[PDB]
Amino acid sequence: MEYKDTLLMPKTEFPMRGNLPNREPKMQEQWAEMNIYEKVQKRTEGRPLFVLHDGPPYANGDIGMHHALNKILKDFIVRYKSMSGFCAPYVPGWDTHGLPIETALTKNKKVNRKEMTVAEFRKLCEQYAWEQVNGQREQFKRLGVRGDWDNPYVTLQPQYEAQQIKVFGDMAKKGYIYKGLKPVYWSPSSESALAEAEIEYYDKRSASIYVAFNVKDGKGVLEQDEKFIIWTTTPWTMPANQGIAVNPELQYSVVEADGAKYVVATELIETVAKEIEWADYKTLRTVKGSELERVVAEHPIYKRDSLVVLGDHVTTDAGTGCVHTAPGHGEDDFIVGQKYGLEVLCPVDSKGHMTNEAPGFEGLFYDKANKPITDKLEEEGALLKLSFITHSYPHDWRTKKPTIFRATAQWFASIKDFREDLLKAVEKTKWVPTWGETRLYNMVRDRGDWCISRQRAWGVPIPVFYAENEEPIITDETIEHVSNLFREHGSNVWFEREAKDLLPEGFTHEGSPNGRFTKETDIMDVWFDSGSSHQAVLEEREDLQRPADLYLEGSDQYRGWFNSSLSTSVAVTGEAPYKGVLSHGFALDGEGRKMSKSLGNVVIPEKVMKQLGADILRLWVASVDYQADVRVSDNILKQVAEVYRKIRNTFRFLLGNLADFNPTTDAVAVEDLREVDRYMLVKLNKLIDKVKKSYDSYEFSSIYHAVHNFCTIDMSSFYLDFAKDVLYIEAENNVERRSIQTVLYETLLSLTKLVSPILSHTADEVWVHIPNVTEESVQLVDMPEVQEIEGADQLVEKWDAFMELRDEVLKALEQARNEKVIGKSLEAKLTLYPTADTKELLASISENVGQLFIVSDLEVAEGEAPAEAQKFSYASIVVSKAEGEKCERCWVVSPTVGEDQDHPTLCTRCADVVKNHYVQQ
Ligand SMILES: CC[C@H](C)[C@H](N)C(=O)NS(=O)(=O)NC[C@H]1O[C@@H](n2cnc3c(N)ncnc32)[C@H](O)[C@@H]1O
Ligand SMILES: CC[C@H](C)[C@H](N)C(=O)NS(=O)(=O)NC[C@H]1O[C@@H](n2cnc3c(N)ncnc32)[C@H](O)[C@@H]1O
Ligand SMILES: [Cl-]
Ligand SMILES: [Cl-]
Ligand SMILES: [Cl-]
Ligand SMILES: [Cl-]
Ligand SMILES: [Li+]
Ligand SMILES: [Li+]
Ligand code: NA
Ligand code: NA
Ligand code: NA
Ligand code: NA
Ligand SMILES: [Zn+2]
């Protein structure tokens, strides 16, 4: 009414309280209308490419917090590269085959794969897959991610399957593919073989056994009264035992008597005494381990032959220097078994039940047969001690049930034949974090061959044919024929055609004179499907190239996508499929616990997406060290939401005070700016350089705190706090108010372009309220390039000290606020007694110290009388009342109020502004 004369914050087109959940979906609607991803791609069509290949997430179900972090971090890098001189094509993917889909249907939808045909079950997997890829893609958009969502890649597409066969064919012609009977992971629950990437370790209770092996033919070294000692945590492997292993040269064994003479390593006398609980024991003689070679023993239950063999695998750390050798259930047992030509026995079927090869335990599940085996051992008297231990045990990654080693005929990729080239690729790759290099390097030098065949249906079949010779037929013509056939009809054709209909039209092989061929039924590892992405996406698609610039996935992908993609590429190309790798940790509860439904700590993305929004989650991603494990909770997200409030209010302050500003020609020159404003320009450019550098180094935690510090204390509390009472009161064409606005305009333009990769819904919302809009969205302009400011270093030293001094003045004002008598910074006059250094800085102030300290008046004298007021380490201060007339417009207590006849209640400053007008109004 009468007490106010406008001069407030006009531009409220950007609301204060951020209702992003109801506003962001509309923001994404316009993004889809304009096809912004195609626009930015077209704008940079000639710029150099930065390819961030997207790791294909599984379609097992809805998205989680971990799914968001992987996509959001990818979105940060792609958006920055788009507006920094690079062309950034990002095509999303989805891994569609393998157990993660079959187990989802079996458990969630209660469908039995054995109650329907193989073709029918595959069709249901295909239907459930496209349901999940549609649901996941919409959820990713809600978070806010830019990519080729309408043209993604999936592993079920015929082009992907066709190219995957080529990858197998290229490695096969190199000789890197072979088939053999070897012990490998077997999951009885899934009735299929597995690999380390498909193995999850959990603690499991197992029965420790110390058992006796009678001596039959000591070869002049041992008498029949001696007995071997064997330690085993797998009783079910005893029926398959074909030998005993002991170290030939390093370890020497001795005979110990406790009423009977036993054979054990000398270094394990005390350890085996406390385990079997021996009372009194004595050592008879010593024997070098190599002397015990070819000694024949007897099976405790079947009294069959068991041959003592030499091996480097037997260790002192075991419970006994003698380890029972079962070539059909162990890797090291198989190697020494083949050296001595020992028979391979696997009395366990695919479902985990003992077969006729174990006479007394046929039909029993291997874990259910442990007790009967021990009972028979004690009946035979060969059992010495029975104990129980808990240790980490391999489990199926989907059924969560334990796995066992089984010696079966499987397809393998000969890693050993090109392991050296794999190690070279790791050394030549840039790994962030740095330990990722050693993580994969050790995984390569210690890895065996890769078992690729899986006894399941939903996946890409192995393209191998067998003649009447039963010889595997792998050749370029067959691979070419099946690859093109898969490109036309898909992998489904292999499961619906005879063997002769999948081969070339006139193919004949020497092994089958009658032309009767047969095909293979096993399928490929789902990690091979994801590992073939570089050939099927980076190479086939024109929008991408190989090698990609960056691979950004989780820590579990070192054994997964990182390993498989490198394995396939180096086998074919010899080089890495990526120039660099970035790794993120695991999402965790606020207390550090794993996010699982059992703990009730699950943070659903859609839950936060509707309670808080998208950019709040985007801020949280940049607020954590993604390179390690990251903690998330509702309270933590609320803290990030509070940060967005500060960013919201500071942005609104910039927009509000820039309403009556048009920098088309009202731009104050750099020299014409106030020295206070020039320092803020240097700080803005320093912030620009730090953010762009941190984007190159992917350190988003630095960016998150830098912007928060740049606004909470530097801008809102220091620079905007002063201009909160100065900008509008003065003239609308005053150089001071225009110079301050030019700083605010440049910060608004630069900061909006800076935050564009991290926050985009709020960035474009602010970009709407921009006086100069030459591009539709902030994502269409490049990042602000840093510009040097003359005399920056001198001003930085001067004004940082001035910023330091102001905070001490404010603390003195807050000390007056503690008194609360004046209770106002502007209504307070000041009498300052400064240090010579402080006085020198005040002398260097060519601006108005009173308006900077938002005080009515300031006087400086060397009074040096502390009294009882205050003294900062650089000045003595007196906060005094002015006692003049308070201006009704600027609220400054000034003696000049009443000097103007037309406006007797206004000071000279306000009276002049009200009376005069520049050109208008
Ligand atoms: C699938 C069955 C569960 C694991 C069940 N809770 C269970 O068996 N629990 S346990 O504590 O008995 N597991 C001990 C492990 O050792 C085997 N075992 C148990 N009792 C004996 C025994 N007397 N002699 C030999 N082996 C034995 C079990 O099979 C299990 O692997
Ligand atoms: C590149 C993806 C792999 C080829 C595989 N399909 C896969 O892991 N698919 S996923 O859907 O399970 N996960 C996709 C991404 O999320 C990471 N991830 C999976 N689980 C977690 C977790 N608990 N915490 C943090 N990150 C996790 C994966 O490493 C991958 O980057
Ligand atoms: Cl099943
Ligand atoms: Cl063992
Ligand atoms: Cl047919
Ligand atoms: Cl067939
Ligand atoms: Li025990
Ligand atoms: Li709060
Ligand atoms: Na059924
Ligand atoms: Na099969
Ligand atoms: Na077969
Ligand atoms: Na995984
Ligand atoms: Zn006034």
Author numbering: 1 to 921
Quoted passage from the original study:
Mupirocin, a clinically used natural antibiotic, inhibits isoleucyl-tRNA synthetase (IleRS), an enzyme that links isoleucine to its tRNAIle for protein synthesis. AARSs catalyze the formation of AA-tRNA in two steps within the same active site. The amino acid is first activated by ATP to form an aminoacyl-adenylate (AA-AMP) intermediate, followed by the transfer of the aminoacyl moiety to the tRNA.
GXHH-mutants showed a lack of product formation during prolonged reaction times even at 15 µM enzyme, confirming that the active site of IleRS1 cannot productively accommodate the non-canonical motif. However, while the binding of Ile-AMS to the active sites of both GXHH mutants parallels its binding to the corresponding wild-type enzymes, some distinctions that are mainly related to the precise accommodation of the adenine base emerged. In PmIleRS1, introducing the GMHH mutation leads to a 1.5 Å shift of the adenine base and a 2.1 Å move of Phe586, which loses its stacking with the adenine moiety. In PmIleRS1, where no rearrangement of either HXGH or GXHH motif has been observed, the histidine at the third position promotes mispositioning of the adenine moiety, resulting in the abolished activity of mut-GVHH-PmIleRS1.
